[PDB]
């Protein structure tokens, strides 16, 4: 007559495998090097080749095509929009989330999605580049740094986060619970039922703590390491939103998708 925390951890893991198109095992298989291998984007020639195959509509406009950096930023946004959709369905697996008022579900997703995006991005990153386009491209870290300002400033802080996050050697069973804990933060601005959310947070963090104790017996400070990573992600998102606002004010061609504009509105 007790909560079965091991079963809850497995439920969360299975919901993560079901709802995210990319998982760390899938990513590692691709990154390791037989059908539809990723096209390597390391310079402008290879960017433009990859676009013609993978996002043909975006480059079908002739001299009306947007600048390379703006096309890349558009693809960044499309990736976020898709991951927002996956996170919204995943959150239904978190005990108590679907019982919250709709407005509180919206608030938790509003503040949590980018922290979750950057945590999970680590799974497709290595020190040399990252998988993109549903695992069909590999874009190099050096190519992204070569873009004109301000677009070269988007990804590098995310690689820096990811290299340290990946050194923790989490697997999908850990990351799924970490993402659920990100979503269940009771201190988000504007929440109505803080008390119930705090209890939901306490429950999922308890599951996470017990799971890490079992799955990582070698790293006795893994749970507090991950609490700190959650705080680091909040700062990474605040900084990312500031850069996006610079782009919005100064780059007239870099249209911001309406779903992401709403996420950013009144965020920080
Ligand atoms: C041809 C393929 C080119 C692909 C270009 C790279 C795609 C990067 C995906 C990660 C996006 C990071 C999202 C943060 S930037 C946009 C946002 O704020 O949502």
Curated annotation (Swiss-Prot):
Family label: Belongs to the nuclear hormone receptor family. NR1 subfamily.
Lineage: Eukaryota, Metazoa, Chordata, Craniata, Vertebrata
Tissue expression from the record: Skeletal muscle, liver, heart and kidney. Expressed in monocytes.
Lineage: superkingdom: Eukaryota
Main location as per UniProt: nucleus
Name of the protein: Peroxisome proliferator-activated receptor alpha
Keyword Transcription regulation: yes
Originating organism: Homo sapiens
A GO molecular function held by the record: zinc ion binding
Chain residues that bind indeglitazar: 80, 114, 264
Any one GO biological process: heart development
Coiled-coil region: none
This protein's record includes keyword Nucleus: yes
NR LBD domain boundaries: 39-266
Record function comment: Ligand-activated transcription factor. Key regulator of lipid metabolism. Activated by the endogenous ligand 1-palmitoyl-2-oleoyl-sn-glycerol-3-phosphocholine (16:0/18:1-GPC). Activated by oleylethanolamide, a naturally occurring lipid that regulates satiety. Receptor for peroxisome proliferators such as hypolipidemic drugs and fatty acids. Regulates the peroxisomal beta-oxidation pathway of fatty acids. Functions as a transcription activator for the ACOX1 and P450 genes. Transactivation activity requires heterodimerization with RXRA and is antagonized by NR2C2.
């Amino acid at each position: 007559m007790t909560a079965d925390l091991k079963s809850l951890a497995k439920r969360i893991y299975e919901a993560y495998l079901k709802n995210f198109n990319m998982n760390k095992v899938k990513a590692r298989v691709i990154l390791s090097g037989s059908n539809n291998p990723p096209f390597v984007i390391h310079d402008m020639e290879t960017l433009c080749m990859a676009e013609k195959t993978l996002v043909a509509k975006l480059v079908a406009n002739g001299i009306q095509n947007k600048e390379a950096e703006v096309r890349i930023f558009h693809c960044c946004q499309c990736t976020s929009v898709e991951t927002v959709t996956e996170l919204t369905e995943f959150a239904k697996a978190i005990p108590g989330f679907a019982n919250l008022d709709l407005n509180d579900q919206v608030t938790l997703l509003k503040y949590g999605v980018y922290e979750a995006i950057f945590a999970m991005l680590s799974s497709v990153m290595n020190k040399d580049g990252m998988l993109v386009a549903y695992g069909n491209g590999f874009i190099t870290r050096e190519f992204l740094k070569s873009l004109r300002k301000p677009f070269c400033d988007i990804m590098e802080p995310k690689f820096d986060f990811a290299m340290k996050f990946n050194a923790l050697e989490l697997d999908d069973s850990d990351i799924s619970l970490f993402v659920a804990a990100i979503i269940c933060c009771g201190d988000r601005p504007g929440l109505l039922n803080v008390g119930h959310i705090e209890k939901m947070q306490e429950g999922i963090v308890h599951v996470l703590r017990l799971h890490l104790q079992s799955n990582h017996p070698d790293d006795i400070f893994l749970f507090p390491k991950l609490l700190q990573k959650m705080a680091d992600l909040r700062q990474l998102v605040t900084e990312h939103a500031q850069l996006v606002q610079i782009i919005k004010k100064t780059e007239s061609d870099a249209a911001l998708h309406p779903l992401l504009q709403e996420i950013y509105r009144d965020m920080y």
